[PDB]
Amino acid sequence: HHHHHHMVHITLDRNTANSWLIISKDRRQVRMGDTHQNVSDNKERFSNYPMVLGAQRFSSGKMYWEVDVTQKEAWDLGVCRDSVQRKGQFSLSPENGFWTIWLWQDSYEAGTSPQTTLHIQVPPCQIGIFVDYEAGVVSFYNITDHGSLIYTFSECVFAGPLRPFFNVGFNYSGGNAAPLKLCPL
Ligand SMILES: CC(=O)N1CCCC2(CCCCCC2)C1
């Protein structure tokens, strides 16, 4: 792909983070802490899952960013509506305002309802995310495999401002402690 020129500088929004997340000083890395991280509750925080939003809101244009997923067993990545549900249980689906892919139990899947199997020959260490607001497109690229396409959501009905979306995943296994990192431009 040739989307690199729409690169945007994404930072994480502390106030939206699940209370067990640790966001780095530069707001470019997030990982799941071994306990509650000593913050007050608020109506923005994701309660049930180790999720956080980017600070940036997008309502027009073309945007591209890259995330490092090295040595993680589980994670979700993509975009979501600014008004997505924060509290309780929910599915990652376009009907609920999410355009996402994930890794879970050695398989990659797109967050359609029901979910779609992805065909990845080279497990990615870095994922590229491309949003075209006007076209209604969210695409995912395998940076480890020379930028090969992973998945395109088309005919997206965003129905609001979009925010970058992250889930570091659970660490029940002790093998998923590694952070998500926003990669340099
Ligand atoms: C180890 C692990 O991953 N756990 C156990 C502790 C609670 C959970 C943390 C993630 C935030 C939401 C609540 C679930 C899951």
Swiss-Prot record:
Induction cue: Up-regulated by IFN.
Domain (B30.2/SPRY) ranges: 8-185
UniProt family annotation: Belongs to the TRIM/RBCC family.
Designated name of the protein: E3 ubiquitin-protein ligase TRIM21
Designated gene of the protein: Trim21
Purpose: E3 ubiquitin-protein ligase whose activity is dependent on E2 enzymes, UBE2D1, UBE2D2, UBE2E1 and UBE2E2. Forms a ubiquitin ligase complex in cooperation with the E2 UBE2D2 that is used not only for the ubiquitination of USP4 and IKBKB but also for its self-ubiquitination. Component of cullin-RING-based SCF (SKP1-CUL1-F-box protein) E3 ubiquitin-protein ligase complexes such as SCF(SKP2)-like complexes. A TRIM21-containing SCF(SKP2)-like complex is shown to mediate ubiquitination of CDKN1B ('Thr-187' phosphorylated-form), thereby promoting its degradation by the proteasome.
Record text about domains: The coiled-coil is necessary for the cytoplasmic localization. The RING-type zinc finger is necessary for ubiquitination and for the IRF3-driven interferon beta promoter activity. Interacts with SKP2 and CUL1 in a RING finger-independent manner. The RING-type zinc finger is necessary for ubiquitination of NMI.
PTM note: Autoubiquitinated; does not lead to its proteasomal degradation. Deubiquitinated by USP4; leading to its stabilization. Autoubiquitinated.
